[PDB]
Amino acid sequence: GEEELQENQELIREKSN
Amino acid sequence: GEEELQENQELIREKSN
Ligand SMILES: [Ca+2]
Ligand SMILES: [Ca+2]
Ligand SMILES: [Ca+2]
Ligand SMILES: [Ca+2]
Ligand SMILES: [Ca+2]
Ligand SMILES: [Ca+2]
Ligand SMILES: [Cl-]
Ligand SMILES: [Cl-]
């Protein structure tokens, strides 16, 4: 769901940084 | 979709390790 998606995008942010 | 979900679970695995 929506929360899973937001958490996913934060994992992507963490890895990109 | 399905690929997004698999990629998400791998990010979770990478972080847990
Ligand atoms: Ca949230
Ligand atoms: Ca959350
Ligand atoms: Ca979060
Ligand atoms: Ca795959
Ligand atoms: Ca893939
Ligand atoms: Ca992969
Ligand atoms: Cl880095
Ligand atoms: Cl670690």
User: How does DSSP assign A1-17, residue by residue?
Assistant: -HHHHHHHHHHHHHHH-
Distance CA B17, CA B14 (A): 5
Q: Given phi > 0 = left and psi -120 to 50 = alpha, else beta, which region is B2? A: alpha
**Does A11 reach chain B within 8 Å, measured CB to CB?**
yes
CB < 8 Å to A15, chain B: 11, 14
Distance CA A11, CA A16 (A): 9
CB < 8 Å to A4, chain B: 8
- The resolution of the experimental structure, rounded to one decimal in Å, is 1.2
Q: Which residue type occupies A8?
A: N
Distance CA A13, CA A2 (A): 17
List of residues 6+ apart from A12 with CB closer than 8 A: B11
The answer to whether B12 and A8 are in contact (CB under 8 A) is: no
Annotated binding site of A: 3, 7, 10, 14
Experimental method reported for this structure: X-ray
